[PDB]
């Protein structure tokens, strides 16, 4: 609101300390969001490993553990997924994440070596080794239908279930506008960005949109009530603007504790 | 006789080069699919109102339309702007000349009292020109390049590049064509709304009106 | 800084933001076109002959660029004096158009010349309005009219109970007999011509030399300005933080060649948002590119007052090329999050203590930053033949804290 | 804020764009009430009797 | 013109304590979802098993 200019900070230091609380926001906000990252991820205190040889009863996790051919060590998936979506001017900053991708891709990875070997019981304590099929004839037996039919009908199970895998791996490759709110979001917070910084051309009715050519062009006496004009909208679009931000960061907060609350129940074990 | 104007008269109305954004700007211009007053005057050039600018075109691939007067009494008494060719310069006279019943010209001057200044510059042809004035600067746009998708008829997509601006300041009202001895149309623009496409190179490849229908 | 802007004499073991820097400029730039389209101003000066005062001579001037500081210090003139106007800002200002008046008078008239005097020629023969007047400029001319000139090719009118108003010529000679009574009581007697001759002879004194004598009367706000004065340029410089002035586009940025292409009748360019891009100088006709100059917020990391007193300071989204004590200081580390200084590199991995940012975080064991680590590893001996089974098991308590509710306040309303 | 006015409305567009902002959280609350009503009451594919 | 100053302060008081209470409902209503939280805890973990 001054694009260095010494008349424009002298007539705004008699304000108060407005910088100070809107500052003390933005950053409770970010922090929010590391500790929201932080908090739903991290949840294993080891990063687990797969098995050099695999063998899980005729079942095929191909598609879905980490390939390490790509530097990246993404699955297949998390390419697509990756592949799939798509989204510093005038004192405006944008602060990278704490966590990057690579060990967000290790927590994931960590997470399914865990449940695949070792099941529900890496979650309570230390992993127990366990082979898969007598983990599936547990996870049967959760839901009523006797241990008896499992191994009776493996073939079958592992047939279904490979196609299946491959149908929503081409359902994910083919069919598009499945990730319709990762989108929105990325394409919220742009816009009003840009709006933010479109609000500058604006007259606001004073004689010109720029600081330096009203200042170069009278005298005082109009000329700070032209620039107290200027001032006092710019903090008022300043100031809808940090209050949309709250709003949405704290709806963002209670669906990160939703999905939280999600991993913690199914992926641990069984609902 | 009348006929429709299908989308020309689409001009760069400012000094800024763009790439690959789309800019919606309200400003005058030519609504689309509007009437224009086509004339025929061969083997004829009545007084037109100006009327805050006007469209022009022609077809004949010589010169037989040479020049365009411009005024608001069409006399001595106030000063009337002259355009006319003569196919290695263009004269432009803004002093004082008086009434010509049947002015002749191609490659009528009566008295230049009270002259104040000059200017001196550079299927068939279209001549598309746009004349508009505001805040005492007189701007005149051309285009010279004709596309023909289809024949007989101005059909197709154009833009206009300025030409001259003039600081001559002066009020006029009354507008006539000059003819030789021995085909333009007309078109009045109105202050409508418009949203322009940029290329990557900063040419206008689409326009779309903002008040003509829902779709829009 | 820190305890200033936390207002205490304690500071507790993290990270806090204190201020921010920028890079300032250093010089001023500014270019207008190439040509100067200069003004046909000398052959009024250098005119060869100058009529009579009764039938002075006029000319319009407009549509110029001419310079009046290379006239101002002229010392070819005998008197340059102006009502209302600076001659040394005479050339940052900008008119419609301008009239100028010349003549020849006596040495001993040019007095006569300005608003509100009286005189035989200053209300018989001109008449300066009762306002401003552009300026009179006089100078000596006795060498090419009290030399060769003619004996009686100037002439003054001397005809009275006419006074002229302003800017009026009366070039109609009239022998004025009144033919009336308030003449003799006669008609046809008191015919005696209007005008005179001056009588002039080499060297005859200072009043009576010839001065040429010419009037500028200036035309302002009365239509769009035609006329101004020239605009002195300078050389550009680059990849420099300099603040510029193209053709009246003002702003502040670094300068980069740019490989893009304009249409030629378009001035510069932006992208979005009314933020310029691109500038073409008039003087080379060369595309240009704008960067903004970097700037940032700064940062410092502490341990805590309690343990020591040494910080590591770190500033954000900045290349560290050019940072400017701290101004080399320690082994500096640029990383993915900026430029941090003060602290050592480590090549191990630990637990992480005080956040940073793109996956780094810096402890004090001095300080050092270093590169998080997950955890653990470790690799479960999978088997399809295998199961482990516990044979102990302990008992233990966790504790977990939730806030329920905060104080109720109330603020008055009109009291505040 | 003009009531149906010329010389309000000139002065109105001169301030910036903040009725579109404004016009698009009402419609985005709307629009969230929809969807929030249809997806608590339809949870069955068929229709019994 | 002591009133044209009036009017000044009280404006500028007005924004100040509307910010205020803004900050206010927006803190009151993430103490509130924290409390229903703390609440179902204290209803499922408590009074049985889970
Ligand atoms: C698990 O599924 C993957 C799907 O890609 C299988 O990999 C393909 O296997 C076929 C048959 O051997 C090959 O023709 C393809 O070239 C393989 N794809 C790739 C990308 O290499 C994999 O063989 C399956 N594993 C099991 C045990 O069924
Ligand atoms: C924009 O300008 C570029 C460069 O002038 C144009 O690219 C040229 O196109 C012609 C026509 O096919 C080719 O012969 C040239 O080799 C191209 N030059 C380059 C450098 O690629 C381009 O066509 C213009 N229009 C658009 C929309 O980009
Ligand atoms: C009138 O003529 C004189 C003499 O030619 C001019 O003075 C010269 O100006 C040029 C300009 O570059 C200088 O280089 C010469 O040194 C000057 N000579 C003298 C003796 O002064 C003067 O500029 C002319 N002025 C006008 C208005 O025509
Ligand atoms: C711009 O003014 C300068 C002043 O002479 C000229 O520009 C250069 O002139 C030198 C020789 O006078 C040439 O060798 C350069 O090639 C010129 N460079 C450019 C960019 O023009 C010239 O008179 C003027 N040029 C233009 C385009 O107006
Ligand atoms: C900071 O800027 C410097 C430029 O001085 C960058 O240095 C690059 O170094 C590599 C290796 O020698 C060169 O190939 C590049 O050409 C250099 N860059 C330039 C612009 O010349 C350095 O990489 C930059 N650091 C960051 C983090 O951006
Ligand atoms: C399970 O662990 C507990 C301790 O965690 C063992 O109890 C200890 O047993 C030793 C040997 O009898 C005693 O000296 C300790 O005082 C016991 N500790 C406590 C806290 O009572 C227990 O023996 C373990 N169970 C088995 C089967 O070995
Ligand atoms: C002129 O407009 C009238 C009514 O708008 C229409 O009937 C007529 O066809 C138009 N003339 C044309 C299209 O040549
Ligand atoms: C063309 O005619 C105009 C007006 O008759 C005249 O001013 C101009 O000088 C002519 N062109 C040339 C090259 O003489
Ligand atoms: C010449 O015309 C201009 C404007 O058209 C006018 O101001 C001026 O008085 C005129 N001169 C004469 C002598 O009529
Ligand atoms: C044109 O006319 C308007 C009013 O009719 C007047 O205000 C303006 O000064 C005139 N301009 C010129 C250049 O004659
Ligand atoms: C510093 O820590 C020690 C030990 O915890 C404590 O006794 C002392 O009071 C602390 N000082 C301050 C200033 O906090
Ligand atoms: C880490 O070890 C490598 C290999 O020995 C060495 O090149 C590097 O300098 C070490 N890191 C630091 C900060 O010294």
Redesign the interface.
Known sequence: ICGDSTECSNLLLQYGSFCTQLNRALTGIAVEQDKNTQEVFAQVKQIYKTPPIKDFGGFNFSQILPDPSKPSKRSFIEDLLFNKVTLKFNGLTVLPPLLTDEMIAQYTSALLAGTITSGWTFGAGAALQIPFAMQMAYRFNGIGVTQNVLYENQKLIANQFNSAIGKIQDSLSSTASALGKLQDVVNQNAQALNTLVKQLSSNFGAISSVLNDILSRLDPPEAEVQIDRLITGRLQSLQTYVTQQLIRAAEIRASANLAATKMSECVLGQS | AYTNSFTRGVY?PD?????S?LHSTQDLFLPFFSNVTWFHAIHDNPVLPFNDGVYFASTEKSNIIRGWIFGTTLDSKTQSLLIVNNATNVVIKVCEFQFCNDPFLGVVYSSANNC??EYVSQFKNLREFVFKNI???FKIYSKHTPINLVRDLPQGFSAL??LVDL?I?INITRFQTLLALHAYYVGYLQPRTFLLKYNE???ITDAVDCALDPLS | ETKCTLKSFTVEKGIYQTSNFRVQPTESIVRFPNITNLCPFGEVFNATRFASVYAWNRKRISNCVADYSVLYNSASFSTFKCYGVSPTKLNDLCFTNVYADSFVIRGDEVRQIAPGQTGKIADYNYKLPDDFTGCVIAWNSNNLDSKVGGNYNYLYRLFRKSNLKPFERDISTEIYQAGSTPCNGVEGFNCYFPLQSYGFQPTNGVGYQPYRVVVLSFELLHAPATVCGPKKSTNLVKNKCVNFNFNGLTGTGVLTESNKKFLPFQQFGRDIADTTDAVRDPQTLEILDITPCSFGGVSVITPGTNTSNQVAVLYQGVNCTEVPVYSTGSNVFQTRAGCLIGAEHVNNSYECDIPIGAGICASYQSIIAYTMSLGAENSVAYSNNSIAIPTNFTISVTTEILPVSMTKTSVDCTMY
């Open positions: 760069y000094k800024v080069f763009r790439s954004v104040t200044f805040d005492g600067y590049e300025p600081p300041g190179n900063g040419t």
